[PDB]
Amino acid sequence: ALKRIHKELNDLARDPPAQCSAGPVGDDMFHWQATIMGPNDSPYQGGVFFLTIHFPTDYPFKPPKVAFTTRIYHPNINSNGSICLDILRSQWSPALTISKVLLSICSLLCDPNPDDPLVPEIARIYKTDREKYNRIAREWTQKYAM
Amino acid sequence: REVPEYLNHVSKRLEEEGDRVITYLDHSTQKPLIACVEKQLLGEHLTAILQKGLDHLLDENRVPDLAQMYQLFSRVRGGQQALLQHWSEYIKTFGTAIVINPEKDKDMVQDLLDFKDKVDHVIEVCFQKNERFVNLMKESFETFINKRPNKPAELIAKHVDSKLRAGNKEATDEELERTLDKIMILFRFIHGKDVFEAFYKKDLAKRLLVGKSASVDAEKSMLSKLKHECGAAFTSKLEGMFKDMELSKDIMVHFKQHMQNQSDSGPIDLTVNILTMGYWPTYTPMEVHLTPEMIKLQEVFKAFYLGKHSGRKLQWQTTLGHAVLKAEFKEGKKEFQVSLFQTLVLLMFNEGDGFSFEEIKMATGIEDSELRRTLQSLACGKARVLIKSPKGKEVEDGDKFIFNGEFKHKLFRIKINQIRQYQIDAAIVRIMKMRKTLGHNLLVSELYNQLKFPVKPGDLKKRIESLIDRDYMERDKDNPNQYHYVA
Amino acid sequence: MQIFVKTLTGKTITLEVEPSDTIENVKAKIQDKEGIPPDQQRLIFAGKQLEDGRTLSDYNIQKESTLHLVLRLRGG
Amino acid sequence: KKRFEVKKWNAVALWAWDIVVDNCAICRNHIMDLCIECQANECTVAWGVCNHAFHFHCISRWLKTRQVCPLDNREWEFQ
Amino acid sequence: MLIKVKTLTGKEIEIDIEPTDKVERIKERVEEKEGIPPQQQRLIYSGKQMNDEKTAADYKILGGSVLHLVLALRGG
Ligand SMILES: [Zn+2]
Ligand SMILES: [Zn+2]
Ligand SMILES: [Zn+2]
């Protein structure tokens, strides 16, 4: 529904989340662009990763197709910039609003789960050697996020 | 010669030299001559001229001389820049005189509005609307208005209340909005704007609940500026008040019909405003010994309103109400629009011509401090409906107030209610980027010079350690005191 | 002291907490405030999971701060 | 001689909710205010055993998509 | 109008601008009230990195429209 998206947009403009920002890209309110500043105390510090939200025609009862536009290093995010959250495919809940899905993604930037990973190649590096992970993620952030 | 005459002398001389060139000197000598004379007349005395004349001249609002001054100073290289300073510093010097002195509170805003209009006028006429001077006019006002925390906002808020009040019949509709527009250009410069709302909201709360607003169209005009100036979030709570007044009248239509359908309608003609508790100023409920006919009227309404909207609760504000008490004096009947406290206390002065301060108190239950204020309104006011024994301005516990049956007043209806963490981080990388190599000691020194807040040594070191971790800065291989720029 | 938390339903509620308090009790306070089970909360501060076996003082949380509440998720 | 009588009266009264607005999560409306779909023109509020409030017109559709409360993960039944 | 430029920490810096100011003006105003020179800002409004030549009216910035500020430590 639009009215749900309208209310989300207004209540986000008034009281924005701290390190998040999302608004329509143009005339079509169903196509937002968001932005997840890299959480502090993480390899993504100082980064600004742009998402691309797409709300379906029944948005309250059906998840939005969010997908990173800035190539992010993450076991749970493929090089194409697609996420695989369980909340976003299987356990979508209408009570969860865009200000919340963006914040949950921001939290998951620091809390991956290499078990059942969308990118096993990075998942193996993360599981085995976390020291190298925090450097490869840092260089990807510096070469894409800044 | 004084500066105002001296500028005329310089204006004369330049044109003579300008006239000489056309007369007999070759045109190729036009420029070096003018610059030569111009350098000596003004270029060597820019500070001397400005100090002697500008500060005096600006106060007198001498339009022509300033126009001559700005016109002349533009010729010198850096002359105009020298004029911005002594003009800018004049604002911060004379401006502070308006705000710093607390003894000038009653005449604060009008000076700020007047002094604002004056400097703007100088920009429009003399300085040829120079955009650079416009900015430093805005930037300068922002500074000195904020040298007094939270008081200019209060006075601007109090000022707008006076303009909008029903007592402000003198300023017509067109005149008023122009005054507000000048205020909004002044309200922008304040920093503690969140303090302006509470002072303007509390005043606006009084305006609606006593119907003293001069022009409803002027009210809605005001918020249309704040909403455009600070967004709907800033003015969200304000607009809720207007809805409540709008919604309350609708409730009165439905409620009044209910009493008409009932054959038992009290002589008391009733109106009650229903206001969303979240928006309005916080009021402390306080109990009063209402009469048996008085207590019923809320009960029918409270049940009625609740019956029409479940989940609500109407907790009353006896303080903000006001009733009418037609009186039977010895020289004609009079009406008294009186608050509930005045209503109850004045309902203690008929059976007995007088009662003690304490005799009334347990009868009604008002707080002593406010009961005294109420009684003062009934004895010491212009409409002396009581005779205080002993007579005086202030009320005492031993007072046996006596009802004034000899009350005389011109009007028939009368009123008595008159009574830093990232900042450190950003600077460190910024400074070190330029340097490309630096020690700890200088890096520490320039921070306080470049940071306008205290910096603890422990906090300062922690950021340095954090920046080392993120590869922003690197220590020397052998000198921990010495850092190097990495990227 | 107290702390602000932004529940899922758009509302905001204030929690009376101490820095020594552990996150498990924080989630229990969220529960008896509105009632989503201790397991399903996932408190977020600066985009960080608030681990159950820790206390606010661990995460550098002070007065008038804000904690964000979401629904429990997982990787993929 | 003795006359305790009142002839008119105006007052005010602040209204507050019994417990809380109970913000619907599906539609983000106010409980007395109708469902977001129902505004476009009898929209009742239906409780879950969680005590969670939802407009019937919202929670019915969500149930038609999922027999799960959106806030809590328990199942949906009224009282 | 007022734009409140809230950074990561949650501090909500107030700013004032005319409807036609170029965003370089916005960054300069942030410099005065916060101290970060315009080279090291990256203002993000509603998920669009503002570009240093666009006028504020381009983005439909209104009263009380919150921006976001993120530090670019390099910042040229
Ligand atoms: Zn409905
Ligand atoms: Zn539930
Ligand atoms: Zn609903």
Residue numbers in the entry:
A (entry chain D): 2 to 147
B (entry chain e): 254 to 672, 692 to 759
C (entry chain U), E (entry chain N): 1 to 76
D (entry chain R): 19 to 59, 67 to 104
Q: From the publication, what sentences describe this entry?
A:
During transcription-coupled DNA repair (TCR), RNA polymerase II (Pol II) transitions from a transcriptionally active state to an arrested state that allows for removal of DNA lesions. CSA acts as a substrate recognition subunit of the DDB1–CUL4A–RBX1 ubiquitin (Ub) ligase complex (CRL4CSA) that ubiquitylates Pol II in response to DNA damage. Therefore, how the CRL4CSA Ub ligase specifically targets a single lysine residue (RPB1-K1268) on the surface of the multiprotein Pol II assembly remains to be elucidated.
To investigate the effect of neddylation on the conformation of the CRL4CSA ligase and its activity toward Pol II, we quantitatively neddylated the ligase in vitro (CNRL4CSA) and analyzed the modified Pol II–TCR–ELOF1 complex by cryo-EM. To stabilize CNRL4CSA and better mimic the Ub transfer, we bound the ligase to an isopeptide-linked UBCH5BC85K–Ub conjugate (a stable proxy of the thioester-linked E2–Ub intermediate). Although, at medium resolution, ranging from 4 Å to 8 Å, clear secondary structure features in densities for all polypeptides could be used to unambiguously dock the CNRL4CSA–E2–Ub and UVSSA structures and create a model that we superimposed onto Pol II–TCR–ELOF1. Upon neddylation and loading with E2–Ub, the beta-propeller B of DDB1 turns 40° in a clockwise direction in relation to the rest of CSA–DDB1, which breaks the interface between CUL4A and DDB1 and allows the E2 to engage helix 7 of the VHS domain of UVSSA that also moves slightly toward the ligase. As a result, the position of the activated Ub shifts approximately 30 Å closer to the unstructured Pol II loop carrying K1268, which halves the distance compared to the non-neddylated ligase. However, K1268 resides in an unstructured loop and might be able to enter the ubiquitylation zone of CNRL4CSA, which would be an intriguing strategy to achieve specificity in this system.
